[PDB]
Amino acid sequence: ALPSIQLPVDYNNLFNEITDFLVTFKQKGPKYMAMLQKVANRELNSVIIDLDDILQYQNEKFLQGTQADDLVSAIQQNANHFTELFCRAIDNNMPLPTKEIDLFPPNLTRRYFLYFKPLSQNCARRYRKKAISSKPLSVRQIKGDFLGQLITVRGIITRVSDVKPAVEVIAYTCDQCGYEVFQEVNSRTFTPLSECTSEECSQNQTKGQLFMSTRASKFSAFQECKIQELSQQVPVGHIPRSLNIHVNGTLVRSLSPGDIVDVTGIFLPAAGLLTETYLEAQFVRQHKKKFASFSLTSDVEERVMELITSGDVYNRLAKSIAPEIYGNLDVKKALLLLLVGGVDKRVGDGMKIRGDINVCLMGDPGVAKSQLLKAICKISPRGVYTTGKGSSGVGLTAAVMKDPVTDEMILEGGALVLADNGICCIDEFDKMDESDRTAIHEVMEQQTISISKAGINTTLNARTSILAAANPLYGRYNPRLSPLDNINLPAALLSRFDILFLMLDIPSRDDDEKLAEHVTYVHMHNKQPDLDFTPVEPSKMREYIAYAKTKRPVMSEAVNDYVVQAYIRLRQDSKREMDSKFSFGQATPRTLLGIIRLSQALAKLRLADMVDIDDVEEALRLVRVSKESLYQ
Amino acid sequence: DAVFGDRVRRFQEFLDTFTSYRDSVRSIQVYNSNNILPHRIIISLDDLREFDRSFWSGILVEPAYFIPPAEKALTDLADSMPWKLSFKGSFGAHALSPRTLTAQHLNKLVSVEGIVTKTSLVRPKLIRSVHYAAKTGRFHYRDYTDATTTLTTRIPTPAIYPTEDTEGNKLTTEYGYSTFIDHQRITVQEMPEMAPAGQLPRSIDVILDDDLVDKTKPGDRVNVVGVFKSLGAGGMNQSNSNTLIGFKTLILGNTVYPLHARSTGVAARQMLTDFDIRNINKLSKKKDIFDILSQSLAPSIYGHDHIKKAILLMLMGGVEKNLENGSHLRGDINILMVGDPSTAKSQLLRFVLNTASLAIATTGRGSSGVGLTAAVTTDRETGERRLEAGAMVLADRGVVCIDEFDKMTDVDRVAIHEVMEQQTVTIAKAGIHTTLNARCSVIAAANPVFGQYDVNRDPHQNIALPDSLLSRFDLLFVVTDDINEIRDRSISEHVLRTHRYLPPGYLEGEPVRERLNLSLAVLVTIPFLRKYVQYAKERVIPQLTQEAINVIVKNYTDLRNDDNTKKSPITARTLETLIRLATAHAKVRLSKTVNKVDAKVAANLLRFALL
DNA sequence: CATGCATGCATGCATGCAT
DNA sequence: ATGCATGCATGCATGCA
Ligand SMILES: Nc1ncnc2c1ncn2[C@@H]1O[C@H](COP(=O)(O)OP(=O)(O)O)[C@@H](O)[C@H]1O
Ligand SMILES: Nc1ncnc2c1ncn2[C@@H]1O[C@H](COP(=O)(O)OP(=O)(O)O)[C@@H](O)[C@H]1O
Numbered sequence A: 001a002l003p004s005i006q007l008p009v010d011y012n013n014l015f016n017e018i019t020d021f022l023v024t025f026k027q028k029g030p031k032y033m034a035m036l037q038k039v040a041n042r043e044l045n046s047v048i049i050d051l052d053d054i055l056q057y058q059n060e061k062f063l064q065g066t067q068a069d070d071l072v073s074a075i076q077q078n079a080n081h082f083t084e085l086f087c088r089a090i091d092n093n094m095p096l097p098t099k100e101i102d103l104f105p106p107n108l109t110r111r112y113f114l115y116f117k118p119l120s121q122n123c124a125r126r127y128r129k130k131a132i133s134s135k136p137l138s139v140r141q142i143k144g145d146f147l148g149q150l151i152t153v154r155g156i157i158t159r160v161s162d163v164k165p166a167v168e169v170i171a172y173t174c175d176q177c178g179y180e181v182f183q184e185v186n187s188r189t190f191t192p193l194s195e196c197t198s199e200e201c202s203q204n205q206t207k208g209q210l211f212m213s214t215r216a217s218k219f220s221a222f223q224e225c226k227i228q229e230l231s232q233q234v235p236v237g238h239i240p241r242s243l244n245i246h247v248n249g250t251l252v253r254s255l256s257p258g259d260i261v262d263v264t265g266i267f268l269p270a271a272g273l274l275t276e277t278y279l280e281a282q283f284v285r286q287h288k289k290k291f292a293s294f295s296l297t298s299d300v301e302e303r304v305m306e307l308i309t310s311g312d313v314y315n316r317l318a319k320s321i322a323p324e325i326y327g328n329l330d331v332k333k334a335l336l337l338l339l340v341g342g343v344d345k346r347v348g349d350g351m352k353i354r355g356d357i358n359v360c361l362m363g364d365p366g367v368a369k370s371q372l373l374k375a376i377c378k379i380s381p382r383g384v385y386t387t388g389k390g391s392s393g394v395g396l397t398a399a400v401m402k403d404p405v406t407d408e409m410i411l412e413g414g415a416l417v418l419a420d421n422g423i424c425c426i427d428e429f430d431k432m433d434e435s436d437r438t439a440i441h442e443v444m445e446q447q448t449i450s451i452s453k454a455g456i457n458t459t460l461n462a463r464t465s466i467l468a469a470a471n472p473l474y475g476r477y478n479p480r481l482s483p484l485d486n487i488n489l490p491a492a493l494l495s496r497f498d499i500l501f502l503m504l505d506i507p508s509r510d511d512d513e514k515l516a517e518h519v520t521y522v523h524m525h526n527k528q529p530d531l532d533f534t535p536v537e538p539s540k541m542r543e544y545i546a547y548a549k550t551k552r553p554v555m556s557e558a559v560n561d562y563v564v565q566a567y568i569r570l571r572q573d574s575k576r577e578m579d580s581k582f583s584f585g586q587a588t589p590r591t592l593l594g595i596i597r598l599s600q601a602l603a604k605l606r607l608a609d610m611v612d613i614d615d616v617e618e619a620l621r622l623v624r625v626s627k628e629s630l631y632q
Numbered sequence B: 001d002a003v004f005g006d007r008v009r010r011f012q013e014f015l016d017t018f019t020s021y022r023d024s025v026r027s028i029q030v031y032n033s034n035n036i037l038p039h040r041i042i043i044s045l046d047d048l049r050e051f052d053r054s055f056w057s058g059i060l061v062e063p064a065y066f067i068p069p070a071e072k073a074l075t076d077l078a079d080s081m082p083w084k085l086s087f088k089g090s091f092g093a094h095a096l097s098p099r100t101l102t103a104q105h106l107n108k109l110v111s112v113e114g115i116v117t118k119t120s121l122v123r124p125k126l127i128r129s130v131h132y133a134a135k136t137g138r139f140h141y142r143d144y145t146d147a148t149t150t151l152t153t154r155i156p157t158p159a160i161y162p163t164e165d166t167e168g169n170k171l172t173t174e175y176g177y178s179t180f181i182d183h184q185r186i187t188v189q190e191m192p193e194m195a196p197a198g199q200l201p202r203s204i205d206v207i208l209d210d211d212l213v214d215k216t217k218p219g220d221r222v223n224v225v226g227v228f229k230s231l232g233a234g235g236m237n238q239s240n241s242n243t244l245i246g247f248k249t250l251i252l253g254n255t256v257y258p259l260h261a262r263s264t265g266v267a268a269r270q271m272l273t274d275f276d277i278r279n280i281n282k283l284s285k286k287k288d289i290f291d292i293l294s295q296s297l298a299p300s301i302y303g304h305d306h307i308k309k310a311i312l313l314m315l316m317g318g319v320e321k322n323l324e325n326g327s328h329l330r331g332d333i334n335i336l337m338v339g340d341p342s343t344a345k346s347q348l349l350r351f352v353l354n355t356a357s358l359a360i361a362t363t364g365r366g367s368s369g370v371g372l373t374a375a376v377t378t379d380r381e382t383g384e385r386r387l388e389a390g391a392m393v394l395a396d397r398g399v400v401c402i403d404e405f406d407k408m409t410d411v412d413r414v415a416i417h418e419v420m421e422q423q424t425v426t427i428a429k430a431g432i433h434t435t436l437n438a439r440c441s442v443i444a445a446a447n448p449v450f451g452q453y454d455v456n457r458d459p460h461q462n463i464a465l466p467d468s469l470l471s472r473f474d475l476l477f478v479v480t481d482d483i484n485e486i487r488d489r490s491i492s493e494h495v496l497r498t499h500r501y502l503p504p505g506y507l508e509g510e511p512v513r514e515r516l517n518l519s520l521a522v523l524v525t526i527p528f529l530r531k532y533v534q535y536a537k538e539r540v541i542p543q544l545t546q547e548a549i550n551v552i553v554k555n556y557t558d559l560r561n562d563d564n565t566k567k568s569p570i571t572a573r574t575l576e577t578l579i580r581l582a583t584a585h586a587k588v589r590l591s592k593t594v595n596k597v598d599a600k601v602a603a604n605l606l607r608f609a610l611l
Numbered sequence C: 001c002a003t004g005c006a007t008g009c010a011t012g013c014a015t016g017c018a019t
Numbered sequence D: 001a002t003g004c005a006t007g008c009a010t011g012c013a014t015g016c017a
């Protein structure tokens, strides 16, 4: 019974190389000793191991000529066993708090969480060692052969739980004899201890009762998540699949629904021989950095300086949005101003005013409206794309649901809650039911939702910017009808937009040749024609817009006097046309607020603390050119 | 004990005689010496019949005492120069369906064809568990087994996970050094094309493991070869359990084949030999190739030479693009026909439905707009709100044939705008937000609003469709039944010629017989057309050249500024259309450059369609 | 099996256009 | 001025947990 087998591993030599690495490696003194010093001194609750460091250490030791072992390979194959080995070594080399403070299982004494960081690809190519832990895989490529290894999965998060306490080492106490018993837990359910097991109680005929002590137990933080496949990975004609993830320690709250991520972990198993699986998270990597995580590190300053000192930045950053689409310079400028936004305003009293810009594009067939909402949903770090048909109103706001992990009942949010602090690009705006658009009004104006159906009586938060696409009433434009009647949006909905462009397709033998040449060049060569313009890459553009969003310009009086005069001029000029029925509506204070917001955004893009008057001039020029196709 | 070795020897000498399978052993083995191919071989039962009848009848009738010996012989051969076996060929009366499977066939090798109705979630199974003891510093291992592992019956063993070593030293699991094997369970039913109408169908479970664990998806046509087995005890062991139950049955699959049908997900495929490739290359040299391949489409219909050219171009298709940023440029072609009654419209839709490698047919008011775009917000047994695929999702990389396209309501027509141009289906409703691929092409037929085409009125008064929709259709054709005298004499003679035809091997007056065509996936005849299309689509990708650039830019500019009247509006999309058609033509010639003739032909075709 | 929410299908009513 | 057709809005049927 229980025979024996021979393997090439050796859990003695590897532990020695572990200690050598952990107290002799340098990129200041030893690298990891300092991290342990911070842990002792109570400034760090997490220690992270970079496999690149281990690889470099063993490569250097090979250069020394002394024989060693392939530690990284051993970790990659069997990774759930090296966690405790590293914890043991870390518990035998810890220092004593240089600063001041104000048998038992070893885990009660530990206060730190060990995590492994996958092995990079560039280091692998540097030292010719093909890396298995840094190869992204789909949820459909993870099969039984991978159980027990350290791998990475690329996907999109769908559902996330709420952090909860999970007991790893229950503690008890005996009122009769005074001993302490410890029980380790590694399962979803457990049975507690009942009667004392000490020497004294054992000898005596009266055995005491034990009591759980909450304060002494080792409670950890537990969270669970679900990850799906990206549409670029699913095979032809199939449906995407899902996978589960566990998060324990100081990684909780590092995953939010809707985020495209690369997550590293250990693929571990859970009456039959069949078994459930899950990924124990060890390191997360976001594909698009959130704007509200920005810091002006030296590198990011060096990168933004080149853009600042390169002259034209407004045109450079507006020509770089969808560089395969010819023309539409003003449209791209207003869409670049969409990303930045104005400056929210609280008046200190119980009143607030939004600071985001809403934009609408109404035009004729085949003018590339959709392909610009698909590029704006990709530049933004938290973008969402939806089509008018495929929507329900509730599907945009919220509904009810129950959490499998815990027993709580939860409210699920729609696309407008996923896009919070982001752009919610709506295509086919005209074709969705008017009883479905009316839920967009409150989001557009108050940046909230109010649900008063059964079970739920509450409010949500949706700090979203809406980029809408629509078409005239009967397909193409009809010059005979009035501009207002040709479109099919009520006045109340129109007022809530700040920019409403009319992209009418009027043939002209001269300009169509340019479009034809651009498109056919885009097809013969897979890139855009111009050899003088070098568009800013999405990452460098996102980094600049993130730096710009930190400002909050104010206004002077020399600009206030201009703004008021322009508002009076526009609001007088508008009544004539509106009465004449050849118009677009009637100017309202929301027009003034939109002008102010556009000026603020143009000021921010310049990295300024004051709004110049050339910004209120650019804003007025944009709002004017918005309708300069109807006057062909 | 002695029969086993004799059977091992008899299969060894069977392999010795026929050396084909010997070849296919070095094959999956020299290549695993740097995807590792799986060690499964396929044997033809016809050869085994002509070699040794007794051994053949044993496999067919008594598999549990004949297959393991053959597997051992195969493993011995491989090692000398484990490996598992799959079977193909004739099965006689053993070839059945879920309806005709009875208790007479238990414990026999059978082949069953049907529709896959319910798949499961693949899971791993434990086959060997390793342990480490630090006190002694040694490794131990346990093994496990279950009923569905082997064909023969083995006394059950007391599966128990070891926790303590014989000396008492505590053990810890080594998850990375254990062994796991994948396992799926599926359900097969009687096909709708064969089940009697009005009667509930019959089902059978099938169990797959290892390398046969994920090869089909629900709603497909499948053929499974495996052993029909029995398990458990239907109350026999119990002193008093019941008198109304029986033994549980299932099939231990060892071969699975997907079958290609009409209006079904699976796509047809043929194996191309050296002869086929040589003939295709020889045929592509002739200058009238675009006419030979074009007059051979539906040769029982008279005329319509241009719609036939368009059909061939749609079948071949253009080349799509994916830019670095992440942009996507369409590469498909779509066709609309508007016509008078009895103009051979539905007979050309059915020809496409029958000759395309993958096509799905739909009528008008029949299927709703959520049945085409896959809005199947439903729920599964696990409880995850799931989207169920639809017609356009299932037809990814295929074709959709829409009949009575004018009867489709606007609430249904507007769901197709995204698919025809964006080639995706983004569904966002309560609790679900996802995007699926719908890279399909559409061919649709319709008739005027007045019953017949009124030439006096303007085209917009007849067609009566939005310009938004009309733009997405690459080519729109108008067909009219104009009463003539010279034309009627030709069209009557042709029709009467078709109705006087006798299949070879028939006696005049003998009725013809009809059958269902379930092929096994993986003027010129129709098979050669399919082979030509497959080769051209799979191994050709042309590239644009300056000459085509000039022709296309001239034609587009001229068309935009015109004083004529068109059946459809002209937008930027038309330019892309000219590029697609050109590429398709270059694909027909098996060329890697879109030459000038391609562009000229595209211009002529579009001009005929419009004017 | 009753309560109440979200999807999808069906019907009947009103308005506009044509004869 | 009347009738017919089309589009929209109100109702119901399903499906659910
Ligand atoms: N100005 C343009 N530059 C480049 N391509 C264009 C331009 N206008 C139209 N196109 C092409 O025409 C197509 C129009 O598709 P789409 O974005 O759906 O138009 P819309 O959404 O306005 O109906 C795109 O594939 C695009 O490549
Ligand atoms: N050009 C033609 N050549 C041969 N047969 C034709 C032709 N046009 C119509 N027919 C015959 O007339 C019948 C009309 O049926 P169908 O194709 O459904 O008409 P529709 O054009 O309304 O779809 C078919 O059975 C077909 O065989």
Ligand SMILES: [Mg+2]
Residues within 6 Å of the ligand: A369, A370
């Ligand atoms: Mg569009």
Ligand SMILES: [Mg+2]
Residues within 6 Å of the ligand: B345, B346
């Ligand atoms: Mg028909």
Ligand SMILES: [Zn+2]
Residues within 6 Å of the ligand: A174, A175, A176, A177, A178, A179, A196, A197, A198, A201, A207, A208, A209
């Ligand atoms: Zn006690």
